[PDB]
Amino acid sequence: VNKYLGPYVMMIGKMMIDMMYFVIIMLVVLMSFGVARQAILFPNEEPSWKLAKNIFYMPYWMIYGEVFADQIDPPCGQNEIQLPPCKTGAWIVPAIMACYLLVANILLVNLLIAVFNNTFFEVKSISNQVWKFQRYQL
Amino acid sequence: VNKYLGPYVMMIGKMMIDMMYFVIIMLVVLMSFGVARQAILFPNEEPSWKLAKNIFYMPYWMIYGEVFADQIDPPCGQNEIQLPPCKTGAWIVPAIMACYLLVANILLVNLLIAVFNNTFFEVKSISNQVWKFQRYQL
Amino acid sequence: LIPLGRKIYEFYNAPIVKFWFYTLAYIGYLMLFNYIVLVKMERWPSTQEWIVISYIFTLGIEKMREILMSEPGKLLQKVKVWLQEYWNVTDLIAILLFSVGMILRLQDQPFRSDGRVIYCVNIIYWYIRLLDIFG
Ligand SMILES: CC(C)CCC[C@@H](C)[C@H]1CC[C@H]2[C@@H]3CC=C4C[C@@H](OC(=O)CCC(=O)O)CC[C@]4(C)[C@H]3CC[C@]12C
Ligand SMILES: CC(C)CCC[C@@H](C)[C@H]1CC[C@H]2[C@@H]3CC=C4C[C@@H](OC(=O)CCC(=O)O)CC[C@]4(C)[C@H]3CC[C@]12C
Ligand SMILES: CC(C)CCC[C@@H](C)[C@H]1CC[C@H]2[C@@H]3CC=C4C[C@@H](OC(=O)CCC(=O)O)CC[C@]4(C)[C@H]3CC[C@]12C
Ligand SMILES: CC(C)CCC[C@@H](C)[C@H]1CC[C@H]2[C@@H]3CC=C4C[C@@H](OC(=O)CCC(=O)O)CC[C@]4(C)[C@H]3CC[C@]12C
Ligand SMILES: CC(C)CCC[C@@H](C)[C@H]1CC[C@H]2[C@@H]3CC=C4C[C@@H](OC(=O)CCC(=O)O)CC[C@]4(C)[C@H]3CC[C@]12C
Ligand SMILES: CC(C)CCC[C@@H](C)[C@H]1CC[C@H]2[C@@H]3CC=C4C[C@@H](OC(=O)CCC(=O)O)CC[C@]4(C)[C@H]3CC[C@]12C
Ligand SMILES: CC(C)CCC[C@@H](C)[C@H]1CC[C@H]2[C@@H]3CC=C4C[C@@H](OC(=O)CCC(=O)O)CC[C@]4(C)[C@H]3CC[C@]12C
Ligand SMILES: CC(C)CCC[C@@H](C)[C@H]1CC[C@H]2[C@@H]3CC=C4C[C@@H](OC(=O)CCC(=O)O)CC[C@]4(C)[C@H]3CC[C@]12C
Ligand SMILES: CC(C)CCC[C@@H](C)[C@H]1CC[C@H]2[C@@H]3CC=C4C[C@@H](OC(=O)CCC(=O)O)CC[C@]4(C)[C@H]3CC[C@]12C
Ligand SMILES: CC(C)CCC[C@@H](C)[C@H]1CC[C@H]2[C@@H]3CC=C4C[C@@H](OC(=O)CCC(=O)O)CC[C@]4(C)[C@H]3CC[C@]12C
């Protein structure tokens, strides 16, 4: 009902579509990194639904400033007590983590910033006019 | 094939070049801070490929919200257990870390935001037109 | 053999060839600086550190030659017109810092670690000065 909050709310509703397209591309890159990390670091696994959870768990929180620094590259196959033998290709995981973090956090979030900023004026004018139209319905 | 996702994908492909130039400048600054930090904190080292890893390891994850807060300036040369003696010039490591984090996270990311933003409209128009052109090939 | 020598002399005096030779030498010098700051140093400098010290000394002599071969006559005016560029000022500061660090490093402990620290701050500067090549 407020003259500034109402257009803001329908403006948010307009940017949800661009957010959805960002979520689709984020989902592709996130599932690629999660599947690769889980399939490299855990070779001998039985069929269980925890694998699907481990696909999405840590790559999703990697977008919001939690990189899980204790699990990026833990010391392995070395006395700390000798650590477990390093899994084959375990060095690939920090490299693909670097590529994933770069692509996600730097490319796609800034691209969504770009699509939010360049479509702001049309969405703002349309939302203001639509709110002034819906005052009658209210 | 989708009318909105396709131009989005080739728009990502167009901003890859600006991301590449950003990666070049970040590589210069990241490599300077990594070389300086490893060369100050570890004076007595044999020739080993782990030095090259330690150049890139911690400064790269410092861009994504993991500052490794336990290793900024650990208490040294003090009974608490008398902690190991402080290395010479170890107080310069947090200072150059502050300068590096400031330059990286505040200047280069926002500059990539700006160049993504001010070239968005031309890239969006060309990507839409090129997608409409490639509908025939599809 | 005379056209071959003419081709060699014409190639090696091209400004693009001189720039790429300068760039490759700077990249090799920076790589040697990386090796001498990462690996430990003994009481006397290694071969790579001697090459780095030679690079700094010849670069300082070259900057002095650029000071002397300038437009004004009175030497303070040449110094002022050379220090009007910020990169020349930072180059002079870095060469003086390398001289101080190398003098401190050639002594015994605890001055050797001080020279090592000054070497690290200088490698920060030269890594930033790669943007001159990028320009
Ligand atoms: C506790 C957790 C799960 C957070 C909850 C997140 C979502 C369930 C909420 C947060 C913001 C909400 C949105 C905020 C604003 C709007 C606009 C509003 O729509 C309109 O005003 C209609 C006009 C238009 O869509 O432009 C209501 C739906 C929507 C998309 C909301 C849908 C539900 C959202 C995504
Ligand atoms: C591309 C982006 C925008 C969206 C993709 C991320 C989500 C689809 C993922 C990330 C975190 C996931 C959740 C992380 C953890 C769990 C708990 C899990 O429940 C258990 O593990 C049972 C309790 C236990 O055993 O501890 C059920 C799935 C769920 C909700 C996951 C569902 C899918 C989520 C929401
Ligand atoms: C294009 C993208 C969206 C494709 C994504 C595919 C995967 C995320 C899905 C599809 C196939 C799924 C698997 C299909 C079958 C199984 C067996 C299932 O086993 C059981 O439930 C145990 C059987 C029992 O004891 O009853 C555990 C989940 C798992 C591994 C699923 C895990 C998640 C997978 C790999
Ligand atoms: C397409 C975009 C716009 C929306 C995102 C949809 C999917 C990415 C989400 C929605 C439903 C989610 C699923 C909902 C429930 C589960 C069961 C969950 O099972 C467990 O956690 C088992 C318990 C355990 O062993 O820990 C594993 C994740 C999974 C397959 C989720 C994977 C991610 C899914 C497919
Ligand atoms: C788990 C990690 C390793 C994530 C994978 C990161 C990269 C291997 C991916 C992520 C996004 C991808 C890009 C997404 C979009 C495009 C556009 C698309 O190219 C086109 O549509 C051609 C026209 C154009 O380039 O504009 C395919 C290449 C490219 C650059 C992709 C190249 C490969 C990238 C960089
Ligand atoms: C300027 C930005 C955008 C790019 C520069 C960063 C990358 C080039 C760096 C950052 C993280 C680095 C990785 C961090 C850790 C490793 C593990 C390392 O493997 C091991 O140490 C073996 C296993 C072990 O000893 O635990 C091999 C190099 C690699 C992949 C590194 C390769 C180079 C990476 C990807
Ligand atoms: C302008 C930018 C791109 C410069 C980047 C420079 C560094 C990333 C490189 C250049 C020279 C490299 C060094 C060249 C030689 C060696 C010796 C090498 O020793 C061995 O492999 C052991 C020998 C054996 O026992 O067989 C270990 C890596 C190291 C220190 C290298 C580490 C990485 C260095 C410093
Ligand atoms: C120029 C931009 C656009 C791309 C970035 C390229 C480089 C910055 C990357 C690509 C290949 C990388 C190298 C690939 C493999 C290794 C071996 C790796 O060796 C180890 O980790 C040894 C194992 C150990 O001692 O733990 C050290 C990093 C290094 C030199 C990487 C350093 C960073 C490099 C040069
Ligand atoms: C033209 C540009 C792009 C590249 C030119 C630079 C390289 C040709 C140089 C710079 C750093 C040099 C390395 C610096 C240090 C060493 C350690 C050095 O080993 C020792 O000093 C200990 C054993 C011994 O005495 O031989 C062997 C040469 C090597 C690998 C050097 C090989 C040649 C490198 C890679
Ligand atoms: C012009 C500069 C800035 C870069 C040019 C690159 C190469 C001409 C240089 C760079 C690194 C140098 C190497 C660095 C270290 C060594 C080890 C060195 O070993 C010894 O001297 C062992 C015996 C002793 O201890 O005296 C022999 C020369 C060599 C291979 C050097 C040969 C010449 C190299 C390849």
Cβ A33 under 6 angstroms from ligand 5: yes
SS3 A79: strand
Question: Considering only alpha carbons, which residue of chain B is nearest residue C40?
Answer: B44
Please tell me what DSSP assigns to residue B86: P
Q: Flag whether residue C103 sits within 8 Å of chain B, measured between CB atoms.
A: no
- Dist. CA C7–CA C17, nearest whole Å: 13
Chain centre to alpha carbon of residue A44: 28
Contact between chains at B124 and A118 (C-beta distance less than 8 A)? yes
CA dihedral B23, B28, B32, B33 (to 10 degrees): -20
CA distance, residue B31 to nearest chain C CA (Å): 8
Q: How far apart are the first and last CA of chain C?
A: 38
The tokens of C34 are what? 């990386």
Asked whether the bond before B84 is cis by omega within 30 degrees of 0, the reply is: no
Cβ A22 under 6 angstroms from ligand 2: no
Q: State the distance from the centre of ligand 7 to the C-alpha of C105, rounded, in angstroms.
A: 23
The tokens of A64 are what? 């919001």
Contacts of C110 in chain B (CB under 8 A): 88
Of the candidates B102, B84, B103, the one whose C-alpha atom is nearest the C-alpha of residue B41 is B84
Cα dist. A59→A19, A29, A35, A44, B34 in Å? Answer: 18, 9, 10, 21, 25
Resolution stated for this PDB structure, in Å: 3.2
- Dist. CA C39–CA B54, nearest whole Å: 13
The three-state (H, E, C) secondary structure of chain A, written as one string: CCCCHHHHHHHHHHHHHHHHHHHHHHHHHHHHHHHHHHHHHCCCCCCCCHHHHHHHHHHHHHHHCCCCCCCCCCCCCCECCECCCCCCCCCHHHHHHHHHHHHHHHHHHHHHHHHHHHCHHHHHHHHHHHHHHHCCCC
The dihedrals phi and psi of B133, each to the nearest 5 degrees, come to -70, -40
The tokens of C125 are what? 């500067």
- Dist. CA B111–CA B126, nearest whole Å: 23
CA distance, residue B7 to nearest chain A CA (Å): 11
Of the candidates C31, C25, C33, the one whose C-alpha atom is nearest the C-alpha of residue C118 is C33
Contact between chains at A106 and B65 (C-beta distance less than 8 A)? no
Q: Which approach determined this entry?
A: cryo-EM
CA distance, residue B120 to nearest chain A CA (Å): 7
Pocket test for ligand 5, best of A60, A99, A101 (most atoms within 8 A of CB): A99
Hey, which residues does B129 pair with through a beta bridge? none
Q: Flag whether residue C135 sits within 8 Å of chain B, measured between CB atoms.
A: no
CB A71 within 8 A of CB A57: no
Please tell me what DSSP assigns to residue A87: P
CB B113 within 8 A of CB A110: yes
